[PDB]
Design a protein around this ligand. Structure first.
Ligand SMILES: *Cc1cc2c(cc1C)nc1c(=O)[nH]c(=O)nc-1n2C[C@H](O)[C@H](O)[C@H](O)COP(=O)(O)OP(=O)(O)OC[C@H]1O[C@@H](n2cnc3c(N)ncnc32)[C@H](O)[C@@H]1O
Ligand SMILES: *Cc1cc2c(cc1C)nc1c(=O)[nH]c(=O)nc-1n2C[C@H](O)[C@H](O)[C@H](O)COP(=O)(O)OP(=O)(O)OC[C@H]1O[C@@H](n2cnc3c(N)ncnc32)[C@H](O)[C@@H]1O
Ligand SMILES: *Cc1cc2c(cc1C)nc1c(=O)[nH]c(=O)nc-1n2C[C@H](O)[C@H](O)[C@H](O)COP(=O)(O)OP(=O)(O)OC[C@H]1O[C@@H](n2cnc3c(N)ncnc32)[C@H](O)[C@@H]1O
Ligand SMILES: Cc1ccc(O)c([N+](=O)[O-])c1
Ligand SMILES: Cc1ccc(O)c([N+](=O)[O-])c1
Ligand SMILES: Cc1ccc(O)c([N+](=O)[O-])c1
Lengths: 555, 555, 555
């Protein structure tokens, strides 16, 4: 194609054309796609995501957007595209699914960048192994896809998938990002083993035991490396020998991932989701403290989650379906909605897995522990209305994907999500302070507070859900202001953020400044050593190649 | 001091002297120690380890040995020593305890290197936190030290330490090496969070949330960075934000570690070790298969271990105390010794943790499962003689360190350990093949086979114990030959090794050659980028700085 | 000499010795002085200042301190010392007087640095010219010295010196720093013309018209450049032709200044100091607003100053001589002390200069303007007790130096000054907000607020006087905390600082970060271009040469 709406820094249209001309010859025109005009700038839907920019844009819609899109047919193409990118110093921005909304979606940090759609063609579930209780996968496999594959193959009785709320995302895309999930296998990054990735220099590289070569059998002769099988231990033990480099690949521009090993929980032989509604707002504090020991003690098995009242209601209804009021709902109004829905001002969803004797025993401990809270009330999914959030999480908590939760994005008219995500201690006092600070700022911006803690062993990801109408420019600015201020306040109180949207990766990296930004400095060193040309996703997590001046690029 | 018995490559005695002269001015003479003569080359004891070379030398005793030794008083000294090392391009080789015997002990890969004794002065238990259920520590803290600290502080009822067999090693030294331990917290590397290390350039760097700075209070003003407190989440969540670099620090020369966060298991409120003796040699196969599901299913909680007959006997007695025979004992003789000691030809030690109802239920499942094996017999520690290996592991399985196990090193006269450690699937067929291959080679070398599997979730570390008399030069050569051959055979069958001795790190790295040694190549890139001068432990895990020619150095 | 208590970064004692050995050969032993021991670390007095470190240390006393001291005999030596410094890459830190206390005194930012005492030998008043109404001077001339020179020469009737509070400082040292003074000639940096300085490369360079060479007369033949006379216009017009580089020399490490032109106010033919006591604390606001127009309108001629009550009392008495209380005095107590001393809660000192008709007219306007304030009261020096602060400033306001003001440093036991100095608008509202913020933080730290505004045309330097006992380590930390917090708060409100102490130049430079620290980046470029080796005062104002890593050095 001819003229992109915008282009990478320091490059002529003459060069873009020779570059794109060459890519089309490689992947064929069916695969390439140049962004020539506004009618191309459509904000999709979660069901059919837009690969050109951020769907949930806090900033201008056309702010971050690609010059083109390119779907490699397979690994060889990636190696090739990468080679061309080096010739032109054209920036790439890889993606498996494009489903990362609330964190910038498919949009690239630096505009005019070519977006590699790793997912379109490399869609394959490469392997599922019952004895090893794991599988292998390409960037294209969403959670739903895997679930079906297990189900078609009747393997669902043998092994369970762990899954985040909405089911559409890339299994590996979410993994590299360290996204959370609900079962005992909830920490996604923790559950991987052996990976494969294309370096900036286009060379292939497996990791961990992935490096020990599978011995040569007559049947495997002549295979290209990307097609060669993995050795037996590759997916069973992550460490390998020597330095453990896998982390360099999480949340970073060090290289493009092509396949990845992921564990799978054997069917536990027992399950029963549950609920415990906390009556008061202040109950958040005692509940957390009651939880701390249950988590360390292994009473609570999976990643449970304390949900705010509005989150469950957002799933059940629009703000309009509850109040004509155009401002943050009052504590009074919040108490009222809970009475309508039968929920507490906070609501703890969780689960039990195992044979009955284990389950019965755990259930006692849990129920007995939470009783210290006046007014607590325990419901099983059966015990609730056929639309309840519980009936839904009951599936999420057992590997069944769904999409019912997107409904909450609809609280305001033109829904658009934006996640603020500070980490917080498994402490009632710390959790209480974080909530208050986040709430007041929200009120200042005119937004309803909404969030959910997701309980890790020694920590909790506090996930603030900023819903906002994507067409009110004023609200957007208030929102940008909201984010930036929240970042600084929590920072000023020991709180970090585990992930964020393109428009703030720079600010958040800056919070990580102990010892004069020593951490970032070490990374850039690794970065430039690995990708001299800064071809791969420059600016991810705030790491900039030497070519990009921090003055022009930071934000 | 004046003249070291050997010196680093490419360096004058004139330079060694100016270098050492300067170090003495920094750390004071009490801290430095030059190796001038043979009387200095004493092979210590496990209780008082030698810092100058390998105690268990398969190779010549004086092969790998330092030019001097230097104990930094604190972090500032390390930064300083490092700075001098760069001026002279003198190679450093860090160590916390020196306890890594069976993997080369305190000896450096490249001879004449200065050995940093990080442990002598930086001995402090920096923190223990009950709510977070973790602690922080300097290189000097051994497992015993921590246990006492917990016990002095009466905290032992609140939190348990995880511990490897012998208790003397460095808590962090073993952690960076990814050493195994017995409780549920057995995977040491997995249990860390937040670290601190000195880069080749001497700059400080915390990691993970360690990077988010603790807000400034009047009390903490003026503190030097190394003395500054960590932010609240630092030890609670390992990921931080951006690339997860911690692995670059495991089994590698990327930098020197100064402190490290480590988790601690809350007292489980229940415990009972157990034993299950497998009668026949061939029972190894079914036992493994019976185990696979129990492990994934969480029936088996901690890292259990299948011990070979001779290992338990070595603890109970010398080969001489069982046979005047100078060659590998026959299967007949092996069957006989088991009858004497009441053990099976294989013996599964493990444990249960939790309230009685959980414990009772698990015990049923386990006992019921293993019964498929004809002749199995279950003993509790009480049910056995007051010297039994079980009475010992009962302590190991609950965080109590010991030293009773060193007795096995004594099988031959001049005991000397050497660990061959291939990883193997949690499969009876795979486990059986690995054992046979390892045994035959052992027989070829005239050595008794001895080993123990240590069961991970999806894998098992097969630990071959090569005992050999450290004074028979012939036996040593047979042993070198043994190792090298075993490395190649297992390689030729998909088997890797998770760790090894200095004399074979090069060979083992070479097994990891998928795609033309792509893995090693990526590392050297990272290496040279990070330490231009190759000052830090060159050759660790086989990674060589550009200065060392692979022709002269590899081995 | 042999061994300095500390040394510059990256340097051997062997090198220090060869370096110092060579300097001694140049300047002779009388001039050099190595710091070998603690007895050398004496905190002097203002009358006999210590050249080795900070007298008023907020930080550890021995924190910032030189390796040695060297007094060049003349310009040639400076050029030479500089040349040696380049060979060794030894850092220099120039100073004229050492009188910069409350900003770190004679101490160097980077420790172990050699301190050039420019003042000892280069002490000469090079010229005084009545028609041009200016003079020329070396680094050694203090204000008192110049005053005497004028007075010996009977020139005092012809021209007046402008002078800061205490009279001991270097006329040029204070000028390059942009220090303030009391007469109409109060802006010191503004009053200079033509300078001379030694570049990092040791080359000489005059500036402005200083560059146009004085034509050659037989009498001036053979003169060395440093001894050559200036052309006629050199001291009369500052701009010269082409880029105006003089500013590169203010508050920066660009080069060492050797002489400098400075204007002198012709005797005005009339003078009368005055006072106006504002009764209430809140009167600060209206007073400022009444002042704004008087300043722009030229009613107020010199740099007047609004003094806080405690400042005048500190001069009159110790906190102990007013209250046994160990904490910040109450507003009540403050009102009481004013009644005792006859002063307002704020007190405006200023002056009139000119023939009587001008003076009479101005006096009316001023008196009439300030009357809008209820309770104001106007005193002439005559109208007050023979110890009054007014009797003192009456001299300061006419070029007469004094030392009476040091008495205020004595408020606490071990007096030690530390200046916080944010700039503020000539507005009652802005001035009021700044005062409140600064006061509350002071109260938080347990310190009495004390300060004085010094009124510029369109702005006011708010000078917060942090007195603190230099031996209470706790108080010191509270103070460090005080400074750092004040810096951030004022920053968060548009307020900058025109100068500061070594321990905070880095933090303050960071406040100046518009557009991604663009300002600092531009400077480092200029820095490294000019001094490749970073020999000259690295870290001044936060500007670091490329050799110093920002991670290790910043603070
Ligand atoms: C709207 C929403 C989002 C959401 C959620 C609930 C709602 C209502 N619940 C989630 C949850 O419980 N846990 C979670 O982690 N995320 C959840 N989200 C956010 C989002 O939907 C998911 O995180 C989703 O998995 C993200 O999208 P996807 O998984 O498809 O990722 P992507 O679009 O490919 O972007 C991935 C990013 O990582 C890097 N990347 C991706 N692929 C590669 C390859 N092959 N190589 C290198 N880097 C890669 C890119 O930087 C890209 O930005
Ligand atoms: C003889 C023996 C050994 C043994 C064992 C049973 C017997 C009878 N059981 C073990 C077990 O159950 N699990 C295990 O991991 N090891 C066991 N061993 C072997 C050995 O005793 C232990 O592994 C022991 O912990 C190792 O010694 P130590 O822990 O003291 O380690 P070290 O002497 O300091 O050497 C550590 C190596 O790692 C690197 N290193 C160490 N400190 C640093 C720092 N600060 N910075 C950077 N790198 C560091 C070095 O490369 C060094 O070689
Ligand atoms: C305690 C105190 C201080 C004070 C004051 C009242 C009291 C009670 N009143 C002052 C006032 O009204 N105005 C003012 O500007 N300062 C006042 N102070 C602070 C201090 O006493 C004076 O500012 C004093 O003039 C500073 O000391 P001095 O003038 O002697 O300066 P120095 O010791 O030489 O340090 C100068 C700095 O500038 C750079 N420098 C100095 N000479 C050179 C040369 N030749 N070349 C290059 N740079 C040079 C150095 O960086 C040095 O740090
Ligand atoms: C809904 C949601 C969004 C982003 C996250 O990171 C997340 N989590 O549990 O980690 C959950
Ligand atoms: C005894 C021993 C020696 C080395 C190891 O690595 C080990 N392990 O369990 O990992 C156990
Ligand atoms: C007393 C004092 C101290 C530092 C200054 O800067 C100052 N000034 O008027 O500029 C006055």
């Amino acid at each position: 194609e001819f003229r992109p709406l915008t282009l990478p820094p320091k490059l002529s249209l003459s060069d873009f054309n020779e570059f794109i001309q060459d890519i089309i010859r490689i992947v064929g025109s069916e695969n390439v796609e140049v962004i020539s005009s506004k009618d191309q700038i459509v904000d999709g839907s979660y069901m059919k995501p837009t690969h050109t920019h951020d769907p949930h844009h806090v900033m201008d819609q056309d702010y971050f957007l690609a010059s083109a899109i390119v779907a490699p047919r397979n690994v060889a193409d990636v190696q090739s595209i990468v080679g061309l990118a080096n010739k032109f110093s054209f920036p790439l921005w890889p993606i498996s699914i494009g489903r990362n909304s609330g964190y910038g979606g498919a949009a690239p940090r630096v505009s005019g960048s070519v977006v590699l759609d790793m997912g379109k063609n490399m869609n394959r579930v490469l392997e599922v192994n019952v004895e090893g209780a794991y599988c292998v996968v390409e960037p294209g496999v969403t959670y739903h896809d895997l679930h079906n594959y297990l189900e078609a193959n009747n393997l669902r009785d043998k092994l369970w998938l762990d899954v985040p709320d909405l089911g559409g995302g890339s299994v590996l895309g979410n993994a590299v990002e360290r996204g959370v999930g609900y079962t005992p296998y909830g920490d996604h990054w923790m559950m991987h083993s052996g990976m494969e990735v294309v370096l900036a220099n286009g060379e292939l590289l497996r990791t961990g035991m992935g490096a020990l070569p599978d011995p040569k059998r007559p049947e495997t002769m002549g295979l290209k490396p990307e097609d060669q099988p993995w050795s037996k231990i590759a997916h069973l033990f992550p460490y390998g020998f020597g330095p453990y480099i896998d982390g360099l690949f999480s949340q970073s521009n060090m290289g493009i991932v092509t396949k990845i090993g992921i564990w799978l929980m054997p069917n536990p032989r027992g399950y029963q989701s549950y609920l415990i509604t906390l009556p008061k707002d202040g109950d958040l504090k005692q509940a957390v403290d009651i939880i701390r020991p249950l988590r360390l003690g292994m009473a609570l098995q999976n990643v449970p989650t304390i949900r705010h009242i509005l989150l469950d209601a957002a799933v059940l209804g629009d703000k309009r379906s509850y109040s004509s009021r155009t401002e943050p709902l009052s504590d009074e109004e919040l108490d009222k909605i809970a009475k309508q829905l039968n929920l507490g001002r906070w609501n703890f969803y969780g689960a039990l897995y195992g044979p009955e004797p284990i389950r019965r025993v755990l259930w006692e401990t849990i129920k007995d522990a939470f009783s210290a809270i006046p007014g607590v009330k325990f419901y099983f999914p059966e015990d609730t209305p056929e639309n309840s959030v519980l009936r839904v999480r009951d599936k999420t908590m057992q590997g069944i994907p769904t999409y019912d939760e997107l409904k909450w994005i609809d609280w305001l008219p033109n829904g658009a999500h934006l996640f603020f995500s500070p980490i917080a201690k498994v402490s009632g006092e710390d959790a209480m302070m974080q909530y208050a600070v986040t709430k007041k700022r929200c009120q200042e911006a005119g937004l309803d507070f909404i969030g959910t803690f997701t309980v890790g062993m020694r920590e909790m990801h506090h996930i603030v859900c900023i819903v906002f109408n994507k067409k009110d420019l004023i609200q957007k600015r208030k929102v940008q202001w909201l984010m930036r201020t929240l970042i600084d306040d929590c920072a000023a109180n020991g709180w970090g953020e585990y992930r964020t949207h393109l428009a703030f990766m720079d600010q958040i990296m800056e919070t990580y400044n102990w010892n004069n930004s020593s951490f970032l400095r070490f990374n850039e060193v690794l970065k430039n050593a690995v990708d001299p040309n800064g071809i791969i996703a420059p600016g991810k997590s705030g790491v900039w190649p030497s070519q990009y001046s921090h003055v022009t690029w930071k934000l």
